[model samples]
Target chain A: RPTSVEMEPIDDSHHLDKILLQARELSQPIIIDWMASWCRKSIYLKPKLEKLAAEYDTKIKFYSADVNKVPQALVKRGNISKMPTIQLWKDGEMKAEVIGGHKAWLVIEEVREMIQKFV
Target chain B: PTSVEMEPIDDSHHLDKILLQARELSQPIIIDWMASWCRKSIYLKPKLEKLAAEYDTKIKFYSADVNKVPQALVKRGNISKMPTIQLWKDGEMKAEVIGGHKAWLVIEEVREMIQKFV
Candidate 1:
């Protein structure tokens, strides 16, 4: 059932720049999930995020960015200071962001409200 | 309002004199077991004195300089952490406060807690 939801692997230097162009053209809100593979909080929150994107499929465009391989410049640009940070972007502006790993329901509720405002 | 006295214990003299003086005193006595190299203890002394003034007649304060005291004597007193503030009531230890950076806050909390004992 998870596979039904498309997952795009973002490598910003190689792929994310081009992908952002496409996302911008389509008028889609890009949800960046900043995560680290070994981070316990990030691992724990992954499934809940996957399910959220699956539920709100048509309303939001989801993208995952791993911080482990990403450059320090890009990480700073994103203002990502912690292990797991989630950000929502639309029309070149960051609309919402969450720092620190929290419960699944809390994340879903926050995302749902933000999507509703733009949609 | 209750009170505590500041009693500094000496190692050269008898422990019984220090304990006896504390017991004979009417105020709440705090025996500060401290050493010269113990940076935490040096920092806490002034703050404890300030607290003694703030609490005024409500409490009596005491300090015990344990620098020259043997390791065995400190152990026998059951000193667990640096700048240990032992509170005496009716000639018996009622409570102890430890640590350094937040010694003021700890003293404030202990002052409130000790109010119940008196």
Candidate 2:
């Protein structure tokens, strides 16, 4: 039995930095989804993003950071002011982002564009 | 219009602590009794969250998933339906707005309740 690729969890700044180092070693552009359980927009955007993650599993990496679980410093470092703030990074350098304020489809489109446009 | 999100009430004990905390501080909270599978509940959450943000520090907004909560707590809430939004103040449920209609209508009812009680 095998399971499909879903977003991995990022717990803290140190963990995120470690992941970024790995992405750097692999030369892959990783996407961090800063989300909250209570935010409707975040909840709505998650699955669609996971679908994207599945498609780009070998190329792009996907990780989800719970706003409540992660420290405020991590959020500040990411410059996150809203839930479902999706950012694309490579070799520890953040390249682009899509703040999920609109509908899920639109957000997915934007995130896809961010991934494609940056790479 | 606001960016704040609702807080989740994880379990019976968490709900109790929040209720007690609110009472101790003489604050009010709106708890949305919801189910993850309910479309209406999903639709109403953002609306309620906007209201929560609009009200800001004056009141707190929380949510409870029916599956995560025990029957004892559900019974205390008198929740016979999903998406029952309750206004709790002074450690008691002051009022409730059942979500069955449009999200806008439900939000209006919740706003009115907040205005009257909070």
Candidate 3:
């Protein structure tokens, strides 16, 4: 299916490095939606998150990390043990996270509140 | 008026980013042609930003003040008025929504335009 937004995909460690570099260079807050394609919640919540990304464009960059596709080391570094985990990072440091395993609207609302505070 | 958050494209580097990203993602881009002294731009910008948030991930939004950019660039886009919102895709302009009407009405029109492409 076609994606609803332009959420960058982190398919490998190199891509993660590129994201980190961009975030550091621009001093931009980055949101990483750590997800797996097989997870139903991830699929359902992606478009909503893309809307959130648009709301904070330029001020924040949004990325999606497929846990199954990325290197184990990168996943370990993100400390992501669950599916559908959303994290906010700045200057190579993790600032916040939302473990999205609830209703889609509730998850997006939680993320919206989190962004209001963080950005 | 100042916006809650927006990356102002005052230089080539910022413009380059939008071009590159549009190419990379194959997504549509929205450029708000603005001028600091233009009263309409000041009033319309924040509302556009809020509307932009609604379409956030599907489209890319940018702002360029006419006074800050080179005259040639402004002329190239043929942006004669302040607060002209142009939509581009694949290195070509797909649509232009001139903003001088009621804020809500202008936003509704832009939303419809975006729906057609997205």
Candidate 4:
């Protein structure tokens, strides 16, 4: 039998409803990656996020929203005019966010710091 | 209308121009301070342009990119916020609005003040 990490895609949106439902039930924080495919910067950050999820397994629920499909309103609700905006959601509410595509280490540090505040 | 002094500033104006004009006019000059990286400044530019068009003869409206100008002078302007529109009236500074704001808000306030001088 394959492990969950081996079987699941790093950016799994196919079973989004189930994942969100599970997250709500478990009270796990959701990390929404609002990314544009054309953005090379976001593509670079994807791998880093995956590595972080592996390192901090089951600590938080992570999800990716393709900006190509979602309504601009949803993006704007996150105050996301810039590309690669990341939102940290807890109990269906945003706890903190970062705008702009910056260095992966900086992003990781910021996310880790924000999560620590809540946890 | 009094023959009060005026100067035009943009990317071209330098410290020399500022100093020369300050002495010639014997008035404290205000720079319509803006920064290139600031998104708010881009939004406010058109409103300033409109203000210039309507009151070009009555007042001097000069724009300066804070990034291009000397950092010392940008500091001297005390630009704590983005898109600050300052006024230097009769050599004594009296008015300043920080942040990109509504055109009517700026116009109403500036006009009321200038009306006093006239």
Candidate 5:
């Protein structure tokens, strides 16, 4: 189910420019979920983070990218080393990251903390 | 009204002293074995406050962040997970409740443990 502030999906290679565009307009932090289908935790966290997006409303924008399909550039862009890695982008720069390896409840709390901390 | 607060044990020496003090007081001390980055650990904290207040005089509630304290203290409890709640009595750990599941159920389990042991 899509929230008022949907957790949008991003592409394999062209996602960074899209983030830059949103970063320019919102001037608020952008949260990106770097995930691959193989990682069960990634599949588990999507809806929960979407729920968070609704709570955040327009204060923050949310996005997700598939890690395995993405080029080396996208992988290097976020410095992602783990599956379901969530990172914060502000003013076109990466600010913070949380690995969603833990359960959804724990992942959601860390993401909430990141939102409040960065924004 | 009278109440209780979760105390912090940051060092091995401090933890030892608190254990000794609790033994002297003849009260059980419930230590929250926490990890700073573990949201499960963070989420259970306020619920623990409620539990703490309910058992104010019967037990001593304390918070121990696993990172800030020495591994020696952690290993003594045989801790294998974050958010482990160990009930220490008479200078030794007697019972434990590990919180690796939903907060509500974990709280219930911990509540049951406290009531049964005390």
Candidate 6:
């Protein structure tokens, strides 16, 4: 059985800060999918991430950031140059980052492993 | 079965709930102030929902039918029009756009306003 989840998107750098702060306050692991709309790989992984978000709902928080929508400074700070850069952050520091340009199932496996390791 | 992605603020309590979450997250909220019987409202709602999905992470979209909500809440937002889209931040109204004309035009205006203010 599969479930769909709705992950919040960080609109700008300011919003990113706010959500990160909230995550820290809650002691929640925040996973961010830095994606681009035009990238085929990102589009393919969107629904999978949504399902994963549903599975980890409340226990973990998931967020998405469009490289085009977010500020350049924040993207630079994250070192996100690839299409779908997935990163997990906790306690105000980045814990893990997976550049998901490979196969969908493999990327999902990596994400699940990352979640188990950090969260 | 389909689950709605956007939250509906049907009453003062619901509004308060969403507002509190928005404040906690430090995110902006968009309210589609509409009426059930208004033709423009019916037409504009689906468009707003579609747009809401695109900005799901960036903004919180809620719907309130004027007829259903308390007069005080409507008055608080100063909502006199049928399809009045309002943007709120920190429990304050930031911007509002009245929708009466073409749907695409109104959506375009909303996109620009969200870009400018948020």
DockQ comparisons of all candidates to the true complex: 0.01, 0.07, 0.01, 0.02, 0.01, 0.01
**Most TM-score-accurate candidate:** 2
Candidate 2 chain A weakest ten by summed lDDT: A67-76
Provide the TM-score for each candidate, comma-separated: 0.45, 0.54, 0.47, 0.42, 0.51, 0.49
Docking quality tier of model 3: incorrect
TM-score of chain A of 3: 0.88
Native contacts retained, all candidates in order? 0.00, 0.00, 0.00, 0.00, 0.00, 0.00
In the range A21-110, model 1's lDDT, one tens digit per residue, is: 776788888887877542445557777777778876766778777554454444445665554677888776677787654576786677
For residues B30-117, write the lDDT of model 4, one tens digit per residue: 4566654345565666656665565544466666665445444554565555666676654444667665457678656656655554
**Number of backbone-clashing residue pairs for each candidate, in the order shown:** 18, 0, 1, 0, 0, 2
Name every residue pair that clashes in candidate 5. Answer: none
lDDT of 3 by residue, A14-80 (tens): 7787888988998777888887553345667888998777777678888988653455556666776
Give DockQ: model 3. 0.01
**Any runs in candidate 2 off by more than 4 Å, and if so which?**
A1-4, B1-118
With candidate 5 superimposed using the best TM-score fit, by how many Å does residue B80's alpha carbon deviate from the native? 1.2
- lDDT (CA) for every model shown? 0.63, 0.77, 0.73, 0.58, 0.76, 0.75
RMSD of 6: 16.8
Task: Estimate the lDDT of model 5.
Answer: 0.76
TM-score of chain A of 6: 0.91
Q: State the displacement of the C-alpha of residue A94, model 4, in Å, after optimal TM-score superposition.
A: 0.9
Alpha carbon lDDT at A118, candidate 6: 81
Off by over 4 Å in 6: B1-118
**Could you give the CAPRI-style class of model 5?**
incorrect
Instruction: Give the per-residue Cα lDDT of candidate 6 at A65.
Output: 81
**TM match of model 6 to true structure:** 0.49
